[PDB]
Amino acid sequence: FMVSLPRMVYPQPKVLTPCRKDVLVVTPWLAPIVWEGTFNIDILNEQFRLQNTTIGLTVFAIKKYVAFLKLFLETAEKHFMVGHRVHYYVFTDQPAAVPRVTLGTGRQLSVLEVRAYKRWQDVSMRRMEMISCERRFLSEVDYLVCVDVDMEFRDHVGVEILTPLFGTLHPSFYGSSREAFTYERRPQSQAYIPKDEGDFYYMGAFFGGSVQEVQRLTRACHQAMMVDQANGIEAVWHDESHLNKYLLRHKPTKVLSPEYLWDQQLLGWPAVLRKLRFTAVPKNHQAVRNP
Numbered sequence: 001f002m003v004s005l006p007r008m009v010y011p012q013p014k015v016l017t018p019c020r021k022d023v024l025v026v027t028p029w030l031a032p033i034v035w036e037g038t039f040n041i042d043i044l045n046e047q048f049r050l051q052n053t054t055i056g057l058t059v060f061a062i063k064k065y066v067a068f069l070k071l072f073l074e075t076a077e078k079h080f081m082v083g084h085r086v087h088y089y090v091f092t093d094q095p096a097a098v099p100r101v102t103l104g105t106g107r108q109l110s111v112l113e114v115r116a117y118k119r120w121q122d123v124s125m126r127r128m129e130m131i132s133c134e135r136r137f138l139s140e141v142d143y144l145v146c147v148d149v150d151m152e153f154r155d156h157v158g159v160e161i162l163t164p165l166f167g168t169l170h171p172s173f174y175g176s177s178r179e180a181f182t183y184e185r186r187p188q189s190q191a192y193i194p195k196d197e198g199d200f201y202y203m204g205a206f207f208g209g210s211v212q213e214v215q216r217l218t219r220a221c222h223q224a225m226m227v228d229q230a231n232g233i234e235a236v237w238h239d240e241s242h243l244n245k246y247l248l249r250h251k252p253t254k255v256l257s258p259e260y261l262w263d264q265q266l267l268g269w270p271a272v273l274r275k276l277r278f279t280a281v282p283k284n285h286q287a288v289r290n291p
């Protein structure tokens with residue numbers, strides 16, 4: 001049950017004036033695409049606080065990637081769901097390497113020890129299994145948000161994202177035609193998507209939803225990866241390939257714009273982005289992924 005909103009004073013929405021004319025703000029299945037200017041955060045904050053919403057954030061920090069945790073968590077404290085209840089779940093092979101980060105009130109962090117796979121591809125892919133293995137979520141949080149650790153928050157990431165199921169537009173492909181998307185194209189793979197199918201190319205580094213929907217997604221992707229492995233095939237973009245297949249066949253209820261997953265070093269700061277919210281931390285891929 002949801003109580004009434006209180007009286008609020010804010011600018012009247014104008015029916016004959018779009019919030020944004022330069023971008024698509026709703027998908028063909030009527031899911032909002034979240035861009036700056038499309039939401040009044042005061043209204044959304046009210047709605048979600050009135051439900052005493054708790055948000056879980058999963059992040060994996062395996063082997064050398066523990067180095068990314070300090071900046072990740074400190075900037076999350078500044079920008080992620082501030083004012084709401086937050087539970088971080090840090091999955092790592094090195095619990096003693098997790099930095100002691102000071103948390104705001106109503107925010108907690110749990111360290112979950114997991115095994116380290118040798119191949120970075122396996123470390124990345126096994127996140128689906130490890131997220132799905134975990135039964136605490138249903139009792140502890142309302143929503144789960146699942147992100148990469150090699151990142152920092154630079155601006156607001158809040159309850160505007162919350163919805164039963166969301167994916168995020170990959171920053172390299174939001175302007176691309178579907179034939180150019182790097183979906184898995186081999187029919188032998190469970191992740192296969194033909195050249196005439198696809199809505200968007202979603203980023204493996206940021207998806208989420210209700211606990212129920214996230215556990216469905218991660219279970220489905222894990223089982224699809226198991227089938228591929230039995231068939232001696234590994235999808236071209238690993239977990240991201242399976243995520244893309246899942247979100248093609250199970251449409252997300254919101255889609256996040258590339259504000260929510262950007263790489264400024266690689267892609268700069270185009271006119272279409274009013275904010276860069278959650279951004280890549282420069283990596284030496286080969287060095288950091290291997291002993």
Ligand SMILES: O=c1ccn([C@@H]2O[C@H](COP(=O)(O)OP(=O)(O)O)[C@@H](O)[C@H]2O)c(=O)[nH]1
Nearest residue numbers: 060061062063065120123124148149150289
């Ligand atoms: O040795 C590794 C390799 C990967 N990861 C995790 O898997 C995610 C995805 O890998 P990565 O960020 O290297 O992929 P990219 O964004 O470069 O495609 C990372 O953010 C980490 O959360 C990790 O913890 N240790």
Ligand SMILES: [Mn+2]
Nearest residue numbers: 148149150205
């Ligand atoms: Mn990453």
